[PDB]
Amino acid sequence: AQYEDGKQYTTLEKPVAGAPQVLEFFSFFCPHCYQFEEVLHISDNVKKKLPEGVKMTKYHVNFMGGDLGKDLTQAWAVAMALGVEDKVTVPLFEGVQKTQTIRSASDIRDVFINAGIKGEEYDAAWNSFVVKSLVAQQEKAAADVQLRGVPAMFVNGKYQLNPQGMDTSNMDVFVQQYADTVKYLSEK
């Protein structure tokens, strides 16, 4: 076929019931994730091609960067609760991987403060039980599906994107192939 299991995607032998439609995992410590976000804008190009009515979910993972990695999963929970994903993602990537000015929870906090979220509002979210279960959700979803590597994308808890089996000579072409694969999978 044109789209083949084991080629642009793999199939989960153990499918995940009731999983979010399009589910992406990343880590701010993850170099390919930096590229997916900064250079390729994968999430955004996928959205642009998804059908009407499909929800897009993105979660952080713990298994990179030890203690800070977990702080980052809680911080991403704060970002989701406050709806400020679009304002912290870039400085978080750059603070961890580019300038290396993120070394502690406090440095993660500074990024939110500088993005305009108020200290009070941040600390309140950070400590809230609405953020805790949002951390739990991130962990559960990664738990449900094997996850030992990022970036990772899953469609309807049954298919996993396989970017290794796509051409990377042209960046734009890789992205379109990636996005089209999600849309194919979405309709499957």
C-alpha 158 chain-centroid distance: 17
- C-alpha–C-alpha distance, residues 176 and 188, integer Å: 18
- C-alpha–C-alpha distance, residues 170 and 161, integer Å: 18
Rg (CA), the chain: 17
Residue 88 C-beta-side C-alpha neighbours within 13 Å: 26
Domain CATH code at residue 110 = 3.40.30.10
Helical ranges in the chain per DSSP H: 31-34, 42-47, 66-82, 85-93, 105-114, 119-127, 129-144, 171-186
- C-alpha–C-alpha distance, residues 8 and 162, integer Å: 5
Give the residue numbers spanning the domain of 78: 1-188
- C-alpha–C-alpha distance, residues 8 and 40, integer Å: 17
Residues facing residue 155 across a β-bridge: 22, 159
Report whether 141 contacts 19 (CB < 8 A). yes
Residues facing residue 9 across a β-bridge: 5, 161
- C-alpha–C-alpha distance, residues 44 and 42, integer Å: 5
User: Which of 23, 28, 34, 37 lies closest to 71 in space, CA to CA?
Assistant: 28
* Tokens matching residue 25: 């995992």
What is the CA angle 59-63-67, rounded to 5? 100
C-alpha 76 chain-centroid distance: 10
Q: What is the dihedral of CA 67, 69, 29, 73, to 10 degrees?
A: -170
Q: How many separate domains does the chain show?
A: 1
Report whether 80 contacts 24 (CB < 8 A). no
In the block, tokens 């000015």 appear at 101
State the chain's maximal CA–CA distance in angstroms: 55
Reduced to 3 states (helix: H, G, I; strand: E, B; else coil), residue 56 is strand
Q: Report how this structure was experimentally obtained.
A: X-ray
- C-alpha–C-alpha distance, residues 27 and 49, integer Å: 24
Q: Is 171 left (phi over 0), alpha (psi -120 to 50) or beta?
A: alpha
Interacting residues of 39 by C-beta distance below 8 A, sequence separation 6+: 171
Report whether 29 contacts 67 (CB < 8 A). no
State the DSSP string of 6-68. Answer: TTTEEE-SS--TT--SEEEEE-TT-HHHHIIIIIS-HHHHHHTTSPTT--EEEEE-SSSSHHH
User: Which of 144, 117, 128, 121 lies closest to 61 in space, CA to CA?
Assistant: 144
Q: Please report the resolution in angstroms.
A: 2.1
Report whether 135 contacts 73 (CB < 8 A). yes
- Asked if residue 15 has a cis previous peptide bond (ω within 30° of 0), the answer is no
- C-alpha–C-alpha distance, residues 101 and 1, integer Å: 48
